[PDB]
């Protein structure tokens, strides 16, 4: 939608040179890496032409004899025919000069690659900061209307971070793309400038590469959706199990539940094991067709271009080199183009806010500035409806008007608009029709920031800012005096209180200050609203938030020393407007009563009769984690080439043993996976050391057997080509298995375990459905990266280091050793650069941390700050604080910088180290020139794939943290298992209930609510209910009497059983339950109602019984399909009227020696009620039946009861006796 290059709009002159120069040298420095090739392949020749002439002064002594032709004084005053062939070149000289230049272009890169970044991330830094200076100076002159449509909840994300997505998008990104692009430019160009039919050659194969890439990217995102829509099968039973686990509980289902999702893991497991056949299988392709492209490459540019005499082999390996680099290059600039889309994409939203004229602002263009104002105010015709909902009315047709120097008090309905009035006179909305005046002046045309300077409000709920009291009341007035803040406390009532608190009025009182109850918080807004001196005065119901002794004291305040000023005043309670000169009643938004108290007691006076009366969810996590791990497995794809310069970058945690002990069951996939890494990791050094092979070969002088060593080395490529294929494929194909194998495993124990939690676990907020369905789906999945593929990894890297270090020591130690001192910087190189980077973020965002913090606090409550505060001083705070960010960011570049172009510079000094030692080794102990790239280029390869070995940073550590997050809950034991050992079972339960006592607090819950001294006893079959108290009793007696939880003290005794010492499943399978909400299973009607005793069989009879017993037998014959009919969310609505029949029959069916129906027939309508109360009454015949309703005594007029509302029972008897008595079972007839 926006155009890239408008991200930019903000910068300036400086930024623009900035920028220019950071291109310029990032030009450079991205020359730099394919330009060196052309200096290596002189050195080569160098080295060819020097081997050709040392084999040939070995043979013995052709032209001691005769004249012939080129013999060792060919360099002197003789007549040799064919000229000078010796002496003329010295290796060590020329050896210097290479290392010379070397060391140059090593220097020059430094220089390029540190103000490349350098420049760049300043100038972004610096538009950043203007951008987010001017966009929140933009936010804050929006009219409110925009910030009612708008959430502060999103705004604070498009502040934090959109923005932060376009630095990345404008940052260094940039400058790696200009470079990356241009090197890839100019290695194509070196190649075709210097040899055409090999550089066309080679790059007529790309094709095939691309289309397996291509390939490997869609698999990418098409398998990423396949494994969602794959375990989504599993994953609703998972939600529908856990989101209902206390009816599961009650029912003893677990086990049904457990085989269910068991039986549908396998559907994600084999999409899993598909998927990572694909991918190892297409990571081989490529692989395999790199290796032919080499060997087509190689035997091409010998046969007929090198061999018959176009081409020197510098030039093969230059142009062979320059491609590959290329070919690198462009494929390492693609993660630029993702953050540029990324960018172009997040400025959309930023720019139209930062370019949206608003409605009504703060300015002081708007037009006309009164004085010595009357404070008169009036409104005609006006009518208003929100903006963030117009459909619905507000105001209609509002004619009235308030006479200066006194009050006017608003009285109406809630929803008749009263308040809505207030927000028009201080011009929050202008009206949609009509007119609003003051003074004789209409609201509009009159200068707003001069407007609300009069007009002082007092909130409806109390708001203060982070800062000191003293400055919280200098808010109101900037040029108010100290004595001048002391003398409107006093008058607010807030100096005395003031006064008391630790350090007076210096002491910080915002949120994150000293807290305080709402009646001093409101009489220090009062204060406020008074230090200015209001000529208006407004009273949005300022004590509505308060409790009746702060309400008292801040009505005190209120109504004292108010007058001369106008007051315009909404009523919280009618009592309070008697004072006023005049009375307006609000009735569907427009003024009727219009008279004193006096004249609107003409009539009855509705309202204030009345009050007198009455009061006197994983998929996102899910599809995160995939994608993010699918993308770190194609980090194997990395291939650098031989020598040339090195691809510079392409709760508690649980112990591995742990880990690994618990995976072992799959191990000989592991081991099958190692030994495909450990050939895959083989692969590297051995083609670097056919690489050097054949450099070895041009210096042969018989040209039949040069090519015949350079065919075999040709078919050796093509083997390693397959050989690769194979095991590549292999290895991913192994890990993927066992991955799946023990995600498998490990979500069935997880699930499995996750049933057996006493239910408190499940209250525990950090236990909620959906984190429990989270940490089962992903974490579960997120394991096996610390299992499969690390060690894989580890295995790879170890082989190829290994392997590379034989080699080289093996073919020349005293060059190694030199070579091999940089070898820890080239491996460190990456790791440091992205633990750095990631340093660096973090610190960056925490330094964001007080930018969200004040930004957060000016917009959360926008309308005091509009209204009665200042809107500036929080823009200029924000200024101010942005200061820190740019601080951080300008030594994140100045760092950063640094450690790159560090990073960039060190190869090619190793490579003049190296080179320069070689020649040495050469000319004095006679080594073979090819040892000399054979061990620079094998320590070097490993050094860089070592390096790569330590980038496990994102994934290991989280996999290991939800390792740990499983073993914690696997090895739990609660205090209430249901699947605990046998316990205190009997054979003769008879139902007989007995509470000693029982003192209960809620866990997770607030320690009140509690249960205390509850003691009630019931006989087999006789009926308990309770009635009284919306809480402190009632019923938690249902849950402590099932083994939800345990008494805190006292005891339950069930048939003289302890219910401690009860068996919980024994127990658990005699009760039968009726919940308030009926929840039931998707599966059919009979398939719930079968539910009831899901442990055995039973025949339909027993069905048919139930559901005749329930009122339901008839209901269902009606429907479609009968008792076969699918329930829940197939579709097939069922009102609550129903699903509670469906309930009461899938608890009777159970034939339970004790009933608990918890609030049941609490249905949406009378009707309802009276289809259920009789199935219900028809249940508990000849049952033990806690009952509880919250209906009048109509329906517990059956048996004994019990009323208290402290949980201890001491009324209690039939209803019939409780009247006798006079009991508070009164209350339910009075």
Not at 125 to 144: D, G, H, L, S, T
Not at 864 to 892: M, Y
Request: charge should be neutral; glycine fraction near 8%.
């Amino acid at each position: 939608r926006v155009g890239f290059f408008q991200l930019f709009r903000f910068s300036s002159s400086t930024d623009i040179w900035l920028m220019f120069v950071g291109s310029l040298c990032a030009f450079l420095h991205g020359i730099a890496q394919p330009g060196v090739l052309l200096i290596f392949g002189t050195m080569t020749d160098v080295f060819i032409d020097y081997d050709v002439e040392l084999q040939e002064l070995q043979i013995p002594g052709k032209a001691c004899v005769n004249n012939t032709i080129v013999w060792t004084n060919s360099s002197l005053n003789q007549n040799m025919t064919n000229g000078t062939r010796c002496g003329l070149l010295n290796i060590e000289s020329e050896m210097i000069k290479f290392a010379s230049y070397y060391a140059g272009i090593a220097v020059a890169v430094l220089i390029t690659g540190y103000i490349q970044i350098c420049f760049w991330v300043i100038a972004a830094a610096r538009q950043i900061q203007k951008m987010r200076k001017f966009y929140f100076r933009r936010i804050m002159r929006m009219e409110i209307g925009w910030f009612d449509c708008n959430s502060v909840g999103e705004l604070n994300t498009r502040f934090s971070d959109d923005i932060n997505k376009i630095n990345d998008a404008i940052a260094d990104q940039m400058a790696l793309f200009i470079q990356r692009m241009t090197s890839t430019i100019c290695g194509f160009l070196l190649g075709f400038f210097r040899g055409w039919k090999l550089t066309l050659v080679i790059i007529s194969v790309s094709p095939l590469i691309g289309i397996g890439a291509a390939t490997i990217g869609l698999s990418v995102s098409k398998f990423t959706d396949y494994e969602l829509k794959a375990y989504a099968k599993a994953g609703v039973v998972a939600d529908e199990v856990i989101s209902s686990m206390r009816t599961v509980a009650a029912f003893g289902g677990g086990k049904r539940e457990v085989e269910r999702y068991e039986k549908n893991l396998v559907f994600a497991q084999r999409w899993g094991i598909r998927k990572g056949i694909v991918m190892g299988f297409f990571t081989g392709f490529v692989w395999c067709l790199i290796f032919l492209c080499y060997a087509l490459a190689f035997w091409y540019g010998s046969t007929l271009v090198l061999d018959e005499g176009e081409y020197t082999p510098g030039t093969l390996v230059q142009i062979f080199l320059s491609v590959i680099v290329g070919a690198l290059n462009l494929g390492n600039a693609s993660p630029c183009l993702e953050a540029f889309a990324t960018g172009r994409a997040a400025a959309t939203s930023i720019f139209e806010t930062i370019d949206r004229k608003p409605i009504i602002d703060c300015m002081s263009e708007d037009g006309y500035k009164l004085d010595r104002i009357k404070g008169e105010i009036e409104f005609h015709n006006v009518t208003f409806h929100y903006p963030s909902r117009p459909e619905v009315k507000i105001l209609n047709d509002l004619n009235m008007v308030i006479k200066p120097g006194e009050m006017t008090a608003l009285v109406g309905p809630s929803g008749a608009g009263k308040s809505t009035a207030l927000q028009l006179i201080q011009r929050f909305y202008d009206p949609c029709e009509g007119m609003v005046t003051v003074d004789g002046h209409d609201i509009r045309s009159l200068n707003i920031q001069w407007l609300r300077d009069q007009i002082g409000i007092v909130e409806q709920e109390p708001v203060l800012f982070s800062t000191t009291i003293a400055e919280n009341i200098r808010y109101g007035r900037e040029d108010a005096t100290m004595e001048d803040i002391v003398q409107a406390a006093k008058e607010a009532n807030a100096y005395n209180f003031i006064m008391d608190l630790p350090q007076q009025f210096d002491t910080l009182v915002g949120e994150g200050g000293g807290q305080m109850s709402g009646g001093q918080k409101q009489r220090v807004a009062i204060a406020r609203a008074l230090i200015r001196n209001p000529k208006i005065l407004l009273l949005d119901m300022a004590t509505s938030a308060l409790d009746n002794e702060s309400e008292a004291m801040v009505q005190e305040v209120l109504s004292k020393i108010q007058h001369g000023h106008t007051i315009i005043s909404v009523a919280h309670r009618l009592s309070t407007v008697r004072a006023a000169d005049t009375i307006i009643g609000f009735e569907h938004g427009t003024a009727v009563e219009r008279g004193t108290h006096e004249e609107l007691l003409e009539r009855k006076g509705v309202y204030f009769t009345l009050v007198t009366l009455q009061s006197q969810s994983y998929q996102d996590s899910l599809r995160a984690s995939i994608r993010q791990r699918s993308k770190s497995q194609l980090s194997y794809l990395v291939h650098e080439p031989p020598l040339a310069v090195v691809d510079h970058k392409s709760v508690e945690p649980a112990p591995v043993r742990r880990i690994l002990k618990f995976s072992a069951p799959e191990w000989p996939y592991m081991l099958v996976g190692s030994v495909g890494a450990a050939v895959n990791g083989t692969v590297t050094p051995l083609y670097a050391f056919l690489f050097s092979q054949i450099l070895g070969t041009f210096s042969i002088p018989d040209k039949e057997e040069q090519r015949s060593q350079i065919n075999g080395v040709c078919l050796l490529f093509v083997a390693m080509g397959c050989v690769s294929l194979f095991t590549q494929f292999l290895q991913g194909y192994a890990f993927a298995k066992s991955g799946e194998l023990l995600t498998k495993r490990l979500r069935k124990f997880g699930f499995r375990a996750m049933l057996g939690q006493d239910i408190a676990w499940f209250d525990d907020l950090r236990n909620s459905p959906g984190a429990l369905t989270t940490r089962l789906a992903t974490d579960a999945s997120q394991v096996q990266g610390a299992a499969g593929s690390q060690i894989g990894m580890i295995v790879n890297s170890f082989t190829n280091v290994t392997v590379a270090m034989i080699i080289a020591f093996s073919f020349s130690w005293k060059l190694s050793l030199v070579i091999l001192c940089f070898f820890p910087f080239l491996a460190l190189s990456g790791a440091t650069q992205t633990r750095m980077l990631t340093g660096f973020a973090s610190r960056d965002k925490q330094a964001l941390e007080m930018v969200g913090q004040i930004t957060n606090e000016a917009l959360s409550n926008i309308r005091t700050v509009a209204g009665i505060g200042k809107e500036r001083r929080f823009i200029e705070a924000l200024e101010t604080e942005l200061e820190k960010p740019f601080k951080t960011a300008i030594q994140k570049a100045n760092i950063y910088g640094f450690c790159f172009a560090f990073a960039q510079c060190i190869m090619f000094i190793a490579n003049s180290a190296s080179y320069r030692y070689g020649g040495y080794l050469i000319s004095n102990e006679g080594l073979h020139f090819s040892y000399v790239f054979r061990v620079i280029s094998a320590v070097v390869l490993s050094a860089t794939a070592l390096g790569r070995a330590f980038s496990y940073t994102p994934s290991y550590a989280k996999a290991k943290i939800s390792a740990a997050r499983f073993f914690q809950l696997l090895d739990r034991q609660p205090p209430i298992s249901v699947y605990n050992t046998a316990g205190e079972k009997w054979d003769n339960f008879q139902g007989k209930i007995d509470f000693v006592d029982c003192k209960f607090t809620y866990p997770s819950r607030p320690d009140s609510q509690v249960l205390n001294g509850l003691s009630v006893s019931i006989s087999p079959g006789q009926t308990l209910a309770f009635v009284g108290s919306s809480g402190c009793g009632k019923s938690t007696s249902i849950q402590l009497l099932e083994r939800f939880y345990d008494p805190d003290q006292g005891k339950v005794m069930i048939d003289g059983h302890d219910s401690k010492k009860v068996n919980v499943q024994f127990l658990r399978s005699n009760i039968g339950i009726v919940s308030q909400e009926p929840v039931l299973f998707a599966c059919s009607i009979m398939d719930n109602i079968k539910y009831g005793d899901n442990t055995k069989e039973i025949p339909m009879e027993r069905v048919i019984a139930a559901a005749k017993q329930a009122q339901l037998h008839d209901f269902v014959m009606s429907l479609p399909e009968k008792y076969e009919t699918n329930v829940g969310s197939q579709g097939s609505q069922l009102s609550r009227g129903e699903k509670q029949r469906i309930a009461i029959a899938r608890a009777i069916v159970r034939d339970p020696k004790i009933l608990l129906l918890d609030e049941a027939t609490s249905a949406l309508d009378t009707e309802s009620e009276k289809t259920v109360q009789v199935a219900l009454d028809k249940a508990r015949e000849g049952r033990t039946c806690i009952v509880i309703a919250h209906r009048l005594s109509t329906i517990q007029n059956a048996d004994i009861i019990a009323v208290m509302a402290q949980g201890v029972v001491i009324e209690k008897g039939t209803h019939e006796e409780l009247m006798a008595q006079k009991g508070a079972y009164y209350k339910l007839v009075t």
